[PDB]
Tab-separated table of N, CA, C and O and ligand atoms in Angstrom:
chain	number	residue	atom	x	y	z
A	1	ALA	N	-26.265	-14.409	10.562
A	1	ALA	CA	-25.116	-14.971	10.273
A	1	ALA	C	-24.279	-13.772	9.415
A	1	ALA	O	-23.663	-14.346	8.557
A	2	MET	N	-23.865	-12.436	10.351
A	2	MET	CA	-22.878	-11.391	9.877
A	2	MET	C	-21.627	-12.220	9.785
A	2	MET	O	-21.271	-12.813	10.378
A	3	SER	N	-20.964	-11.648	8.867
A	3	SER	CA	-19.401	-12.256	8.636
A	3	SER	C	-18.797	-11.990	9.635
A	3	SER	O	-18.719	-11.072	10.467
A	4	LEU	N	-17.541	-12.569	10.060
A	4	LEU	CA	-16.879	-12.460	11.030
A	4	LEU	C	-15.441	-11.571	10.900
A	4	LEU	O	-14.467	-11.361	11.403
A	5	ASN	N	-15.471	-11.606	8.901
A	5	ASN	CA	-14.295	-11.206	8.310
A	5	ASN	C	-13.390	-11.553	8.823
A	5	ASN	O	-12.198	-11.048	8.563
A	6	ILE	N	-12.843	-12.891	9.208
A	6	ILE	CA	-11.911	-13.918	8.870
A	6	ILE	C	-11.222	-14.172	7.445
A	6	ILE	O	-12.347	-15.173	7.425
A	7	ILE	N	-10.381	-13.949	6.723
A	7	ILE	CA	-9.859	-14.847	5.745
A	7	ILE	C	-8.762	-15.523	5.851
A	7	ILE	O	-7.982	-15.119	6.393
A	8	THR	N	-8.884	-16.676	5.130
A	8	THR	CA	-7.348	-17.527	5.004
A	8	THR	C	-6.931	-17.259	3.865
A	8	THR	O	-7.841	-17.381	2.661
A	9	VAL	N	-5.694	-17.354	3.561
A	9	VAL	CA	-5.068	-16.701	2.074
A	9	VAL	C	-3.758	-17.729	2.283
A	9	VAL	O	-2.875	-17.533	3.109
A	10	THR	N	-3.705	-18.727	1.109
A	10	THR	CA	-2.676	-19.692	1.167
A	10	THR	C	-2.154	-19.420	-0.297
A	10	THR	O	-2.539	-19.403	-1.530
A	11	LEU	N	-0.743	-19.114	-0.718
A	11	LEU	CA	0.167	-18.473	-1.210
A	11	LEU	C	1.151	-19.655	-1.568
A	11	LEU	O	1.860	-20.251	-0.609
A	12	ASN	N	1.389	-20.008	-2.719
A	12	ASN	CA	2.004	-21.097	-3.449
A	12	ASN	C	3.520	-21.081	-3.506
A	12	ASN	O	4.362	-21.879	-3.180
A	13	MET	N	3.877	-19.579	-3.695
A	13	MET	CA	5.680	-19.020	-3.459
A	13	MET	C	6.186	-19.824	-4.799
A	13	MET	O	7.495	-19.438	-4.155
A	14	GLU	N	5.650	-20.447	-5.333
A	14	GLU	CA	6.663	-21.324	-6.788
A	14	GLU	C	7.066	-20.269	-7.200
A	14	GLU	O	8.616	-20.180	-7.699
A	15	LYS	N	7.033	-18.990	-7.747
A	15	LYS	CA	7.207	-17.831	-8.812
A	15	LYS	C	7.499	-16.702	-7.723
A	15	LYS	O	8.067	-15.490	-8.297
A	16	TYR	N	7.712	-16.695	-6.386
A	16	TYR	CA	7.463	-15.332	-5.870
A	16	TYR	C	8.709	-15.734	-4.513
A	16	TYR	O	8.964	-16.914	-4.279
A	17	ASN	N	9.893	-14.686	-4.086
A	17	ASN	CA	10.695	-15.021	-3.754
A	17	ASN	C	10.290	-14.599	-2.109
A	17	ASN	O	11.195	-15.125	-0.865
A	18	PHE	N	9.397	-14.015	-1.869
A	18	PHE	CA	8.934	-13.096	-0.660
A	18	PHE	C	7.436	-12.417	-0.667
A	18	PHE	O	6.770	-12.607	-1.715
A	19	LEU	N	7.076	-12.427	0.586
A	19	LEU	CA	5.566	-12.002	0.393
A	19	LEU	C	5.352	-10.522	0.238
A	19	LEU	O	4.624	-10.472	-0.761
A	20	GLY	N	6.525	-9.540	0.425
A	20	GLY	CA	6.688	-8.494	-0.021
A	20	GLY	C	5.591	-7.556	0.626
A	20	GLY	O	4.905	-6.853	0.415
A	21	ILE	N	5.886	-7.507	2.058
A	21	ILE	CA	4.888	-6.633	3.222
A	21	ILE	C	5.945	-6.457	3.985
A	21	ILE	O	6.923	-6.779	4.182
A	22	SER	N	5.288	-5.153	4.581
A	22	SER	CA	5.870	-4.569	6.079
A	22	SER	C	4.728	-4.611	7.191
A	22	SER	O	3.563	-4.592	6.730
A	23	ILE	N	5.094	-5.090	8.362
A	23	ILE	CA	4.289	-4.789	9.623
A	23	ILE	C	4.424	-3.970	10.598
A	23	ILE	O	5.858	-3.532	10.711
A	24	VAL	N	3.422	-3.835	11.255
A	24	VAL	CA	3.428	-2.168	12.407
A	24	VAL	C	2.668	-3.283	13.812
A	24	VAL	O	1.982	-3.791	13.716
A	25	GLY	N	2.876	-2.323	14.778
A	25	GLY	CA	2.071	-3.279	16.041
A	25	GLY	C	2.887	-3.845	16.787
A	25	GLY	O	4.122	-4.287	16.635
A	26	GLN	N	2.200	-4.356	18.171
A	26	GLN	CA	3.017	-5.732	18.790
A	26	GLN	C	1.512	-5.947	19.852
A	26	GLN	O	1.152	-6.901	19.676
A	27	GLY	N	-2.053	-6.015	18.362
A	27	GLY	CA	-1.868	-6.892	17.749
A	27	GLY	C	-0.850	-6.484	16.279
A	27	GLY	O	0.080	-5.330	17.000
A	28	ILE	N	-0.339	-7.337	15.403
A	28	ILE	CA	0.333	-6.751	14.271
A	28	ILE	C	-0.394	-6.905	13.109
A	28	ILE	O	-1.382	-7.911	13.226
A	29	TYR	N	-0.332	-5.546	12.542
A	29	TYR	CA	-1.004	-5.503	11.293
A	29	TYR	C	0.115	-4.971	10.167
A	29	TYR	O	1.382	-5.061	10.012
A	30	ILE	N	-0.598	-5.377	8.769
A	30	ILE	CA	-0.159	-5.397	7.282
A	30	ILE	C	0.441	-3.726	7.341
A	30	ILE	O	-0.678	-2.833	7.432
A	31	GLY	N	1.327	-3.114	7.555
A	31	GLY	CA	1.560	-1.569	7.596
A	31	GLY	C	1.704	-1.205	6.150
A	31	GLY	O	1.031	-0.074	5.936
A	32	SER	N	2.142	-1.964	5.138
A	32	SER	CA	2.427	-1.550	3.912
A	32	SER	C	2.182	-3.008	2.981
A	32	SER	O	2.876	-4.274	3.598
A	33	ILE	N	2.128	-2.979	1.481
A	33	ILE	CA	2.411	-4.170	0.958
A	33	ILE	C	3.343	-3.880	-0.693
A	33	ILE	O	3.085	-2.658	-1.256
A	34	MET	N	4.296	-4.338	-0.658
A	34	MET	CA	5.372	-3.909	-2.040
A	34	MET	C	5.234	-4.945	-2.996
A	34	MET	O	4.643	-6.144	-2.722
A	35	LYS	N	5.355	-4.086	-4.416
A	35	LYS	CA	5.416	-4.605	-5.698
A	35	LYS	C	6.304	-5.779	-5.572
A	35	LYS	O	7.275	-5.528	-5.381
A	36	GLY	N	5.660	-6.773	-6.567
A	36	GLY	CA	6.921	-8.020	-6.836
A	36	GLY	C	6.758	-8.855	-6.079
A	36	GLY	O	7.473	-10.079	-6.372
A	37	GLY	N	5.985	-8.715	-4.774
A	37	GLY	CA	5.846	-9.647	-3.840
A	37	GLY	C	4.717	-10.503	-3.890
A	37	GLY	O	3.473	-10.395	-4.759
A	38	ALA	N	4.407	-12.029	-3.359
A	38	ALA	CA	3.453	-12.971	-3.585
A	38	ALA	C	2.073	-12.128	-3.183
A	38	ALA	O	0.844	-12.348	-3.662
A	39	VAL	N	2.331	-11.248	-2.088
A	39	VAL	CA	0.855	-10.752	-1.410
A	39	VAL	C	0.217	-10.095	-2.484
A	39	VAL	O	-1.133	-9.778	-2.626
A	40	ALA	N	1.072	-9.098	-2.881
A	40	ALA	CA	0.807	-7.971	-4.233
A	40	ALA	C	0.062	-8.876	-5.072
A	40	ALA	O	-1.123	-8.434	-5.716
A	41	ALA	N	0.362	-9.578	-5.693
A	41	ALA	CA	0.110	-10.586	-7.004
A	41	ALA	C	-1.439	-10.978	-6.420
A	41	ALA	O	-2.059	-11.477	-7.427
A	42	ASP	N	-1.184	-11.662	-5.483
A	42	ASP	CA	-2.886	-12.530	-4.830
A	42	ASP	C	-3.671	-11.440	-4.822
A	42	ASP	O	-4.995	-11.846	-5.373
A	43	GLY	N	-3.604	-10.298	-3.831
A	43	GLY	CA	-4.159	-9.007	-3.932
A	43	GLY	C	-5.466	-9.155	-2.912
A	43	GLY	O	-6.079	-8.203	-2.909
A	44	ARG	N	-5.400	-10.609	-2.289
A	44	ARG	CA	-6.668	-10.378	-1.337
A	44	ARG	C	-5.978	-9.925	0.303
A	44	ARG	O	-7.118	-9.093	0.661
A	45	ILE	N	-5.329	-9.702	0.574
A	45	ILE	CA	-4.392	-9.367	2.098
A	45	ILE	C	-4.231	-7.948	1.507
A	45	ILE	O	-4.039	-7.451	0.314
A	46	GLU	N	-4.726	-6.817	2.403
A	46	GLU	CA	-4.970	-5.071	2.283
A	46	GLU	C	-4.117	-4.679	4.031
A	46	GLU	O	-3.822	-5.514	4.803
A	47	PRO	N	-3.412	-3.556	3.371
A	47	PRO	CA	-2.677	-2.815	4.910
A	47	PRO	C	-4.048	-2.794	5.652
A	47	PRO	O	-4.937	-2.328	5.131
A	48	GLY	N	-3.725	-2.510	6.967
A	48	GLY	CA	-4.743	-2.246	8.079
A	48	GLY	C	-5.289	-4.010	8.490
A	48	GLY	O	-5.880	-3.979	9.600
A	49	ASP	N	-5.136	-4.728	7.587
A	49	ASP	CA	-5.349	-6.368	8.168
A	49	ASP	C	-4.702	-6.889	9.240
A	49	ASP	O	-3.499	-6.417	8.943
A	50	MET	N	-5.076	-7.666	10.398
A	50	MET	CA	-4.522	-7.647	11.496
A	50	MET	C	-4.275	-9.108	11.216
A	50	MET	O	-4.783	-10.260	10.949
A	51	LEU	N	-2.715	-9.900	11.449
A	51	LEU	CA	-2.412	-10.842	11.424
A	51	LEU	C	-2.727	-11.949	12.720
A	51	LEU	O	-2.220	-11.427	13.566
A	52	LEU	N	-3.257	-13.186	12.420
A	52	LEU	CA	-3.857	-13.743	13.572
A	52	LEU	C	-3.031	-15.087	13.795
A	52	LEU	O	-2.218	-15.257	14.302
A	53	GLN	N	-2.561	-15.855	12.121
A	53	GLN	CA	-1.626	-16.915	12.362
A	53	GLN	C	-0.681	-16.974	11.030
A	53	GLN	O	-1.699	-16.734	10.041
A	54	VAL	N	0.227	-17.405	10.730
A	54	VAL	CA	0.972	-17.787	9.515
A	54	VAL	C	1.395	-19.357	10.076
A	54	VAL	O	2.615	-19.169	10.671
A	55	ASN	N	1.470	-20.160	8.867
A	55	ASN	CA	1.525	-21.517	8.861
A	55	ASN	C	1.308	-22.264	10.290
A	55	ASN	O	0.212	-21.402	10.581
A	56	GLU	N	2.317	-22.563	11.126
A	56	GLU	CA	2.004	-22.614	12.514
A	56	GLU	C	2.044	-21.921	13.714
A	56	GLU	O	1.646	-22.110	14.671
A	57	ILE	N	2.219	-20.984	13.549
A	57	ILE	CA	2.538	-19.754	14.477
A	57	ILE	C	1.502	-18.652	14.520
A	57	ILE	O	0.958	-18.028	13.676
A	58	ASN	N	0.661	-18.417	15.455
A	58	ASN	CA	0.019	-17.654	16.178
A	58	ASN	C	0.550	-16.019	16.591
A	58	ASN	O	1.529	-16.292	17.266
A	59	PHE	N	0.363	-15.073	15.827
A	59	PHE	CA	0.760	-14.039	15.918
A	59	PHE	C	0.289	-12.902	16.761
A	59	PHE	O	0.306	-11.804	17.371
A	60	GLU	N	-0.841	-13.370	18.013
A	60	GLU	CA	-2.040	-12.162	18.611
A	60	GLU	C	-1.111	-11.658	20.020
A	60	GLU	O	-1.582	-10.569	20.042
A	61	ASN	N	-0.479	-12.285	20.635
A	61	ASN	CA	0.710	-11.531	21.811
A	61	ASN	C	1.899	-11.770	20.884
A	61	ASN	O	2.606	-12.765	21.801
A	62	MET	N	2.898	-10.949	20.038
A	62	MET	CA	3.981	-11.291	20.022
A	62	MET	C	4.685	-10.270	19.536
A	62	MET	O	3.764	-9.332	18.884
A	63	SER	N	5.825	-9.663	19.888
A	63	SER	CA	6.794	-8.418	19.782
A	63	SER	C	6.539	-8.413	18.157
A	63	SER	O	6.697	-9.367	17.603
A	64	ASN	N	7.056	-7.157	18.188
A	64	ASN	CA	7.313	-6.502	16.350
A	64	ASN	C	8.491	-7.311	16.070
A	64	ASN	O	9.008	-8.115	14.925
A	65	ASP	N	9.501	-7.199	16.729
A	65	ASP	CA	10.989	-8.022	16.607
A	65	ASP	C	10.681	-9.648	16.225
A	65	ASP	O	11.174	-10.015	15.495
A	66	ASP	N	10.103	-10.114	17.225
A	66	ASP	CA	9.739	-11.407	17.215
A	66	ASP	C	8.828	-11.963	15.739
A	66	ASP	O	9.552	-13.005	15.326
A	67	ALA	N	8.177	-11.214	15.416
A	67	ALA	CA	7.310	-11.207	14.318
A	67	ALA	C	7.852	-10.978	13.004
A	67	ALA	O	7.999	-12.012	12.121
A	68	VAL	N	8.706	-10.176	12.704
A	68	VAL	CA	10.040	-9.822	11.983
A	68	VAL	C	10.708	-11.051	11.625
A	68	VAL	O	10.741	-11.869	10.802
A	69	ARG	N	11.336	-11.779	12.525
A	69	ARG	CA	12.367	-13.263	12.785
A	69	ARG	C	11.457	-14.102	12.405
A	69	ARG	O	12.028	-15.085	11.350
A	70	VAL	N	10.447	-14.475	12.836
A	70	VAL	CA	9.514	-15.633	12.298
A	70	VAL	C	9.228	-15.808	10.804
A	70	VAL	O	9.073	-16.862	10.631
A	71	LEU	N	8.543	-14.615	10.870
A	71	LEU	CA	8.166	-14.502	9.109
A	71	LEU	C	9.419	-14.469	8.277
A	71	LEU	O	9.262	-15.842	7.034
A	72	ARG	N	10.775	-14.334	8.346
A	72	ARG	CA	12.034	-14.342	7.579
A	72	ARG	C	11.927	-15.977	7.532
A	72	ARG	O	12.225	-16.582	6.602
A	73	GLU	N	12.122	-16.419	8.611
A	73	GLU	CA	12.012	-18.139	8.900
A	73	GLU	C	11.143	-18.960	8.010
A	73	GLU	O	11.665	-20.076	7.138
A	74	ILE	N	10.057	-18.153	8.069
A	74	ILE	CA	8.650	-18.854	7.299
A	74	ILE	C	8.850	-18.824	5.792
A	74	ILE	O	9.045	-19.877	4.998
A	75	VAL	N	9.753	-18.121	5.428
A	75	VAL	CA	9.381	-17.639	4.079
A	75	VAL	C	11.042	-18.046	3.266
A	75	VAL	O	10.801	-18.352	2.143
A	76	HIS	N	11.757	-18.002	4.140
A	76	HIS	CA	13.220	-18.857	4.113
A	76	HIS	C	13.372	-20.219	3.352
A	76	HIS	O	13.510	-20.574	2.541
A	77	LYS	N	11.885	-20.925	4.189
A	77	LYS	CA	11.310	-22.397	3.937
A	77	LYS	C	10.757	-22.254	2.376
A	77	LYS	O	10.016	-21.639	2.615
A	78	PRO	N	10.969	-23.359	1.866
A	78	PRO	CA	10.410	-23.449	0.800
A	78	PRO	C	8.981	-24.433	1.042
A	78	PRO	O	9.246	-24.847	1.748
A	79	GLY	N	8.042	-23.808	-0.091
A	79	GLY	CA	6.474	-24.508	0.208
A	79	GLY	C	5.422	-23.111	0.600
A	79	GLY	O	6.131	-22.579	0.508
A	80	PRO	N	4.304	-23.833	0.496
A	80	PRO	CA	3.115	-22.751	0.454
A	80	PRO	C	3.207	-22.140	2.272
A	80	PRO	O	3.680	-22.631	3.132
A	81	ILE	N	2.521	-20.829	1.792
A	81	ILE	CA	2.252	-20.078	3.428
A	81	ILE	C	1.202	-19.571	3.198
A	81	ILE	O	0.490	-19.195	2.307
A	82	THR	N	0.269	-20.332	4.596
A	82	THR	CA	-1.257	-20.057	4.645
A	82	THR	C	-1.217	-18.547	5.809
A	82	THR	O	-0.830	-19.015	6.762
A	83	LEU	N	-1.746	-17.446	5.506
A	83	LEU	CA	-1.764	-16.242	6.448
A	83	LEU	C	-3.456	-16.241	6.904
A	83	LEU	O	-4.469	-16.158	5.766
A	84	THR	N	-3.940	-16.218	7.747
A	84	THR	CA	-5.035	-16.159	8.614
A	84	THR	C	-4.878	-14.447	9.052
A	84	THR	O	-4.306	-14.052	10.152
A	85	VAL	N	-6.056	-13.705	8.774
A	85	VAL	CA	-6.248	-12.247	8.930
A	85	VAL	C	-7.494	-11.730	9.425
A	85	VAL	O	-8.593	-12.568	8.794
A	86	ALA	N	-7.771	-10.669	10.248
A	86	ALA	CA	-9.096	-9.876	10.593
A	86	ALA	C	-8.953	-8.566	9.702
A	86	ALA	O	-8.291	-8.382	10.019
A	87	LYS	N	-10.271	-8.903	8.872
A	87	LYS	CA	-10.138	-7.812	8.190
A	87	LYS	C	-11.134	-6.809	9.059
A	87	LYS	O	-11.650	-5.707	8.505
A	88	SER	N	-11.677	-6.816	9.937
A	88	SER	CA	-12.636	-6.265	10.910
A	88	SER	C	-11.561	-6.098	12.204
A	88	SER	O	-11.968	-5.139	13.167
B	101	QEZ	O1	8.456	-11.420	2.870
B	101	QEZ	C1	8.202	-10.407	3.487
B	101	QEZ	O2	7.869	-9.596	3.205
B	101	QEZ	C2	8.904	-10.340	5.109
B	101	QEZ	C3	8.336	-9.240	5.641
B	101	QEZ	C4	8.547	-9.708	6.890
B	101	QEZ	BR1	7.648	-8.065	8.269
B	101	QEZ	C5	9.944	-10.037	7.553
B	101	QEZ	C6	10.244	-10.742	6.513
B	101	QEZ	C7	10.046	-10.826	5.244
B	101	QEZ	N1	10.534	-12.166	4.329
B	101	QEZ	S1	12.286	-12.400	4.474
B	101	QEZ	O3	12.856	-13.496	4.317
B	101	QEZ	O4	13.223	-11.044	5.106
B	101	QEZ	C8	12.578	-11.484	2.673
B	101	QEZ	C9	12.286	-10.064	2.213
B	101	QEZ	C10	12.550	-9.561	1.253
B	101	QEZ	C11	13.086	-10.197	0.046
B	101	QEZ	C12	13.349	-11.718	0.358
B	101	QEZ	C13	12.931	-12.390	1.520
B	101	QEZ	C14	13.585	-12.736	-0.606
B	101	QEZ	C15	14.578	-11.840	-1.832
B	101	QEZ	C16	13.821	-11.092	-2.537
B	101	QEZ	C17	13.806	-10.122	-1.281
């Protein structure tokens, strides 16, 4: 029962305006993590992690443009953000 290295992270976003991440690729990967963001504060998500799902949206075959657009609309809405990432 070796780990599949799939981790799910729920951020409450009460104290943070933004995830504070950049993304690369077209899978979609965490390119970098910004200081002062909810992701940096939580600390679980790292650069090179592959983005599988954020809230109700799957990211597995999505353009970089479409990924940036969807993430803004998700971060714009108030309430928790759940990210599912592949660490392998
Ligand atoms: O929240 C992010 O880090 C983010 C990442 C990508 Br990739 C695309 C969009 C993102 N969110 S965002 O709504 O554009 C955003 C980015 C920065 C900030 C905000 C929103 C809110 C004010 C503080 C600075």
